[PDB]
Design a binder for these strands. Structure first.
Lengths: 405, 120, 113, 66
RNA sequence: AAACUCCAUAUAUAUAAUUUUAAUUAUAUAUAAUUUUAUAUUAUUUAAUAUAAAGAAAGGAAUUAAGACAAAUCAUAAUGAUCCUUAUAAUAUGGGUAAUAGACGUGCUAUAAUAAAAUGAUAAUAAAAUUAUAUAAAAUAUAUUUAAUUAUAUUUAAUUAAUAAUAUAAAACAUUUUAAUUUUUAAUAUAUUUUUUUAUUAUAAAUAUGAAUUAUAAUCUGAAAUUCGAUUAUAUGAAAAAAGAAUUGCUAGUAAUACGUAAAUUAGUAUGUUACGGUGAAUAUUCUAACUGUUUCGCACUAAUCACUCAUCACGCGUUGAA
RNA sequence: GGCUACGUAGCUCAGUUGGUAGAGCACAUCACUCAUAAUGAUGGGGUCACAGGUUCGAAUCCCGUCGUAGCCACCA
RNA sequence: AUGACCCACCAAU
RNA sequence: AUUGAAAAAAAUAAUAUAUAUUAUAUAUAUUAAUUAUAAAUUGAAAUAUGUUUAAUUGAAUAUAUUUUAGUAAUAGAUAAAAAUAUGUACAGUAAAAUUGUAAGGAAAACAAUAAUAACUUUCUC
RNA sequence: GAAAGAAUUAAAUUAAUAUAAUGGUAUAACUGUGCGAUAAUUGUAACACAAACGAGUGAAACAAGUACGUAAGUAUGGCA
């Protein structure tokens, strides 16, 4: 009553939120689905699969899913092992000499499901995955910022902490201790415990594991170096591989000048911002992971303005010198180019895939009887393939639940 | 949030515009880069201000011209022509369209505020 | 029972009041008491001496002034008249400030006006 | 109508036993507009204060010299 | 009246060497529907209501009669009569039409979440209209650091029109925000919601709505913005909490639209006028009331019910009664 | 002439046994009407006729003048 | 043209 | 009495304890307290015992135990504001007026408004 | 020469006093205060003053006890 939404049920949040967080799944009917594994992909080809509990754990920490995704329809987020995606695509990753791909596509065509299909590989494939979702959340101008003249890069403490925690929690602890500081590190200390007593912090080279470095507790103007080293340790070493995973990179493929004004009102580039450097450089090749199993998947998504960067960069339009920076950051292009970056234009759904999904969609009764009884089967099938622009997974859902005309 | 520059503010209140609000000598663009020099991450609320930081905040407003200090400057610019032979001075002193608006009808506004020390 | 304003008033009152804020009485031993007396008496004597010194000095100055003014009257009447004027609205200059505990950054100003 | 704090029975201070109100005071350093520091006893707990607007930067007190 | 008429719609022919390119069009023409055919109930020789079946089938505009209101115009013009010709006639400069106690009508912009603002360069999507008393594209400089947007300034490309310009339509759609709202955050940890969760501490009626308004500087046009125009930047941020009795528009591509667009009158300014399109509804016929045409009955009214008419009182003035 | 009650918002009438800054009607402003008038919804005015005085607080009160029906009525 | 005025509405067989 | 630090006593008063005398005395001993009194889930803090740091100190920190904080006026033998008007004892002087002074004004509160001979004490040339 | 005290004179009873009016009041009755809260007690009252009487007014003292005060003491209600 007097307390906001005193009632336990919370819907006051913008519905997109109501869908994101509400613990509504609950009711979802439990379905005994096959498990997503790449080694067993021949058994589950063109079928709806559930992720492993270990996969889900890492995916949740990495935030592999998104609020817009109708993930609330089911007890847990599910996917189809599409063969032009999962199967065929993952093969490129486990086969391409550059392991540097960009999952593009048409909005909704699930360029994100794929990326999450990819963190799925990494969970079982036992690698170390470092997704950096909604980059914007660091180019937004909302989180903290300060300089670091030991690196000439504005750093974003608070933001780094979130990403650092994501990597440590999602990745398998053992799979982490495996990398031992390949050198020395000496930063601050504010661990409530040994804080007012031990002035600074120390990591011995071979008694200290990367898991430890990623568990330090530093004071704001230090977390930055923590990252330099976090990455650097993992980076240089060659024991396990890497998957610098960036979704929505588009935002950073274009909107350079960030949001944070510096100290002369002048705008701060997205490259003078530490995470920008951590983000682009690796993409470029200015930073190399030893392990040849180094993997890099960057992927543009729909919620984001478009511009000449990607298209030109990837070679889909000759360089037009006379354009405008607001739509062609010449640099971002160069970086990609000098990095040999490749594209997996995510293909839409085939008719039978549609059926498939719609079949699973029937199970949990996540449909509407206007078409369950009163329609044969082929009827509807052909229909959604149609009312879905011939292949936008989301449209199918948009056209099978949300729209009660 | 506290007694910042005396008439302070409240938490949750992003500082950028907050300054444009309470303060009269500063607003909009002025308040924007005012934070920029003090370098506070934008979209930052009052509660987060590290008291010492407010100190800088205060000094900053001292640097430029803020508070009713300028209210007077205009008051004088008004009195100026007013003191000379100035249609305005009449319009301003009588409480009538100083912008030569609708004296005949819509003029209550002028009568309401337009006056010797206008900004009251 | 009481409002927040009433509470704050009570707190304010307490700040001023001697209720449960004051220590025990300063008791002394007889030897200590004597020592204290000797300290105080000596101090008082010293203060008296200082007062007399200052007072004596002032008296001496006054006598010197008197001696001067008589001489001036004897010699040059106009000069005497000029000296002996009503200094009713005489104001000490605002530069002659009350000496602080520690000195400023710039000790002395060599330029003025 | 009249807002008041209603009095309790007063505590009898006996003749001779009345003690002088020695309030708790800290030695406080005031640095004025210029670097001239001055010690003053003060009831508020702050060992050091530095002042912005004083007599030492006001034109009335020295005519010759957000 | 209807019909022909104009826009608009279906088809068909002719034209366009498909570089004026929109052939999904533009017109000139022709036909077309004021729809028709058939059965079944009713009725009485053949109409209505349902059903099917054939077709694309559906609207708007213009035209508002006679008369009356002695309605409006003698300031569009014109003219009778009457009034002045050294002034009620003509010219220049300045002023006025912009004045303001109150009152009215009409708009505009408003009062925030079944709603407002940034942003969207493979430029989502239009019609109508303008441009030899000209529109004025790209850029170029500044406001301002990048760039974009927005507003001015420099130079005039092309087009005098199915060629080029005004002008990338905007709303919708997506993402991001958003006071009150403690619905927030930010410091921790917490974790199979990660753009999120949870435990703890903190976060004391006009707002980040509203732009009336007030200063200063700057820019347009023209000799000239002072009474008196427009624009912007920096400042200012009143009133306004959906508004009493009462009352207005609208029945379908209409209303509604925080949807834009154009023109005419401009040296110059639209919150107005006249046109264009985008999205696009509920509600309904059954009562009273009002206005009209058809009719009943009544009617003492007839410049006609805003008619007409009656007695007292009050005013002034005759005649004739009682006493 | 001391000597009983009355001196109100434009009009009338308030209030009572204090716990006070009412009523309609007229008036101004809307609306309703073809235009009035009713009707309807909105604002206007008390020095609750003057002095001084009291309980915490008198329109009220005490305390009497400038004001309203007045006061003659042991005559042989 | 003569030609300053108009006044009343209440609820059923 | 017990620890710190590094023979005894001797006024005055007070308390403690005693005892002399149809004398409120003395004797020894020591110098308490001196603004307080229930009732506080939470505030604060002290001690004792539980984990890491150099047996072991400090830190954190947990449980008991308590202590604090119930916040409140007079601090003056008060002195012409309001409070009790009988007794006693001690002590002091009012009002008016005028020059003033944030609001403050005729009318708030507040400050200042006679005279020092002599006398004593202390310093002092 | 100075301080400090003790004060002294003047002035005042116009303030004030439980309340009218007068009389008294700073030697203070008036005011502040500590204590107390008793004498706002109990028997005999001489003797006056006033006075027709009945009444009334002051009151030494004797005795019993209470209070405050180092003490002198004062107190049998209030300045009258």
């Amino acid at each position: 009553s007097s307390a906001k939404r005193v009632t336990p049920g919370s819907l006051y949040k913008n519905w997109t939120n109501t869908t994101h967080t509400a613990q509504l799944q609950q009711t979802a009917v439990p379905l005994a689905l096959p498990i997503f594994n790449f080694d067993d992909i021949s058994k589950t080809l063109n079928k709806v699969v559930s992720y492993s509990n270990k996969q889900y754990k890492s995916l949740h920490h990495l935030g592999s899913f998104k609020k817009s995704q109708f993930n609330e329809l089911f007890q847990k987020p599910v996917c189809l092992v599409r063969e032009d995606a999962t199967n065929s695509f993952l093969k490129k990753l486990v086969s391409h000499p550059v392991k540097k791909f960009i999952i593009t596509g048409e909005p909704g065509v699930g360029k994100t499901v794929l990326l999450s299909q990819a963190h799925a590989y990494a969970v079982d494939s036992k690698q170390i995955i470092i997704n950096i979702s909604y980059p914007e959340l660091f180019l937004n101008g909302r989180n903290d910022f300060s300089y670091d003249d030991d690196l000439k890069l504005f750093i974003q403490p608070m933001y780094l902490k979130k990403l650092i925690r994501k990597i440590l929690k999602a990745n398998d602890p053992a799979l982490l201790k495996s990398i031992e500081l390949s050198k020395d590190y000496k930063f601050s200390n504010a661990n409530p415990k040994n804080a007012s007593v031990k002035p600074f912090v120390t990591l011995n080279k071979t008694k200290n594991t990367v898991l430890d470095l990623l568990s330090v507790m530093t004071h704001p103007h230090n977390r930055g170096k923590l990252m330099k080293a976090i990455i650097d340790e993992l980076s240089v070493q060659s024991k396990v591989p890497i998957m610098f995973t960036v979704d929505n990179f588009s935002k950073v493929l274009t909107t350079a000048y960030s949001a944070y004004r510096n100290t002369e009102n002048k705008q701060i580039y997205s490259l003078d911002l530490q995470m920008g450097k951590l983000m682009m450089d690796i993409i470029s090749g200015e930073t190399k992971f030893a392990n040849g199993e180094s993997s890099t998947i960057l992927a543009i998504s729909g919620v984001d303005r478009t511009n000449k960067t990607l298209p030109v960069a990837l070679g889909k339009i000759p360089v037009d010198p006379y354009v405008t920076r607001y739509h062609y950051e010449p640099k971002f292009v160069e970086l990609l180019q000098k990095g040999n970056v490749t594209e997996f234009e995510v293909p839409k759904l085939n008719k039978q895939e549609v059926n498939e999904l719609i079949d699973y969609y029937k199970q949990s009764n996540v449909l509407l009887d206007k078409d369950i009884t009163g329609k044969k089967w082929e009827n509807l099938i052909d229909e959604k393939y149609f009312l879905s622009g011939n292949g936008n997974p989301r449209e199918l859902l948009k056209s099978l639940v949300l729209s009660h005309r | 949030v506290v007694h910042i520059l005396g008439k302070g503010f409240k938490g949750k209140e992003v500082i950028k515009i907050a300054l444009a609000s309470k303060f009269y000598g500063i607003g909009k663009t002025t308040a924007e880069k005012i934070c920029s020099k003090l370098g506070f991450y934008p979209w930052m609320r009052m509660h987060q201000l590290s008291e010492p930081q407010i100190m800088s905040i205060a000094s900053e407003l001292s640097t430029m011209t803020i508070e009713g200090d300028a209210r007077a400057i205009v008051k004088d610019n008004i009195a100026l022509k007013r003191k000379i032979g100035s249609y305005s001075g009449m319009r301003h002193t009588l409480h009538l369209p100083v912008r030569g608006q609708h004296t005949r009808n819509n003029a209550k506004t002028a009568r309401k505020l337009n006056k010797i020390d206008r900004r009251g | 029972s009481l409002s927040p304003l009433a509470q704050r008033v009570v707190t304010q009152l307490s700040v001023m009041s001697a209720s449960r804020k004051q220590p025990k009485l300063l008791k002394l031993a007889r030897e200590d008491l004597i020592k204290h007396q000797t300290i105080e008496k000596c101090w008082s004597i010293y203060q008296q001496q200082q007062r007399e010194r200052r007072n004596l000095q002032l008296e001496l100055q006054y006598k010197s002034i008197e001696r001067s003014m008589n001489l001036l009257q004897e010699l040059s009447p106009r000069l005497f008249e000029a000296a002996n004027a009503s200094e009713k609205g005489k104001r000490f200059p605002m530069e002659m400030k009350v000496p602080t505990d520690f000195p400023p950054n710039t000790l002395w100003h060599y330029n003025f006006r | 109508t009249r807002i008041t704090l209603p009095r309790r029975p007063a505590k009898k201070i006996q003749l001779g036993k009345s003690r002088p109100a020695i309030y708790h005071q800290f030695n406080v350093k005031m640095e004025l507009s210029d670097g001239s520091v001055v010690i003053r006893r003060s009831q508020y707990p702050k060992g050091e204060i530095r002042l912005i607007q004083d007599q030492r930067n006001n034109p009335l007190w020295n005519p010759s010299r957000g």
